[PDB]
Symmetry: C2
Subunit: 222 residues, 2 copies
């Protein structure tokens, strides 16, 4: 099968199973965190799929398993930034939290060894990782999804700072959103304080996850 | 290094040995390659070489960018993505780097240059095309003497009219050049480790010779 850092994938016949673990990356292991991420992923991806966006989710199998369609994944991490934060401020400066004029899409070769080096489309073509067409699809999908998700959390007055995606090809060569969608892959903040936020997070990390889930459940029932 | 100093309608770019005596060689090399590039239709800030270390150049508003063109996988390219050192690239690869020492000159794709206010798609786009042309013409130039260009770095700026122009210099300080069929030797690096100007001298003489010296 295959055991990654936060989840394990097991190919079962036609479909595949994706089990979310309780690990963290301040590495550790919070209890019930896998179930939380599995469910918010399933809620978010369901919302996306009924909109036409292709994702690998077939269904949610409580508590921490997702029935997914196999995909031939790209060794890539596609990040969309709506606001300046993280490695973005450390590389180009700016005000963490400042809005960008438009959504920024960045590619990173997923390679924990040499760490995850950034790449531009030209790189993907030369390294034969993806074609100019696939790359451009992934970019279009990433932004589409990012905006759709942005409007989603918007209903709750929460703002999406940035989020990371991973895509793959299904049995027909379609670009499909794989991986997950949870606090582990995106930075979401209250509409318009560092100290405070940092406090509860250090108090008990599982709190932001619980809050995100409840939030998704809430918006999901409307 | 070297120091630029405007002289009214033009500028004077003085190459300093900054501790050696390479500035003269570097200026002459830059003048020879940059002059050959011009007849190839490429636009550079070169007006003329004023021996032994100055260049009469047209004033330019420089882009805070180091644009790299790789012909073969080497240096930072293999470290980042692996692959065999010296392996030729299907097509030249252009990479952009912001000049920010405090931030370690982060790489930036086109969408960055624009979103960051550094350049426009059209400018970035243009620096790419030029960089590839210059590189190919330079690779061709050295192949006539059995030398292979591995990678090189250029800097561009905008002239008073606003178009992309090649700036800075072209010398051993900006490109990696090896003779085809070179087998690295321990004793050679070592002993010759006392003559830093050696590579500069051979390059300059290489260019003079090719310049139909």
């Amino acid at each position: 099968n295959y055991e990654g850092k936060t989840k394990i994938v097991k190919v079962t016949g036609d479909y595949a199973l994706l089990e979310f673990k309780d690990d963290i990356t301040k590495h550790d292991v919070l209890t019930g965190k896998g179930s939380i991420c599995a469910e918010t992923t399933a809620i978010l991806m369901k919302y996306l799929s009924e909109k036409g966006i292709k994702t690998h989710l077939v269904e949610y199998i409580p508590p921490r398993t997702l029935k997914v369609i196999p995909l031939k994944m790209f060794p890539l991490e596609v990040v969309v930034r709506l606001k300046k934060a993280g490695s973005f401020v450390r590389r180009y400066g700016g005000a963490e939290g400042e809005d960008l004029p438009v959504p920024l899409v960045e590619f990173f070769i997923k390679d924990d060894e040499r760490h995850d080096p950034m790449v531009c489309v030209d790189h993907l073509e030369i390294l034969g990782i993806a074609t100019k067409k696939q790359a451009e699809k992934m970019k279009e999908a990433a932004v589409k999804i990012t905006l759709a998700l942005k409007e989603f959390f918007e209903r709750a007055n929460f703002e999406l700072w940035d989020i990371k995606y991973e895509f793959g090809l299904d049995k027909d060569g379609n670009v499909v959103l794989g991986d997950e969608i949870s606090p582990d892959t995106f930075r979401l903040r209250k509409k318009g304080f560092d100290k405070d936020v940092y406090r509860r997070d250090l108090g008990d990390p599982l709190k932001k996850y619980r809050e995100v889930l409840e939030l998704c459940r809430s918006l999901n029932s409307q």
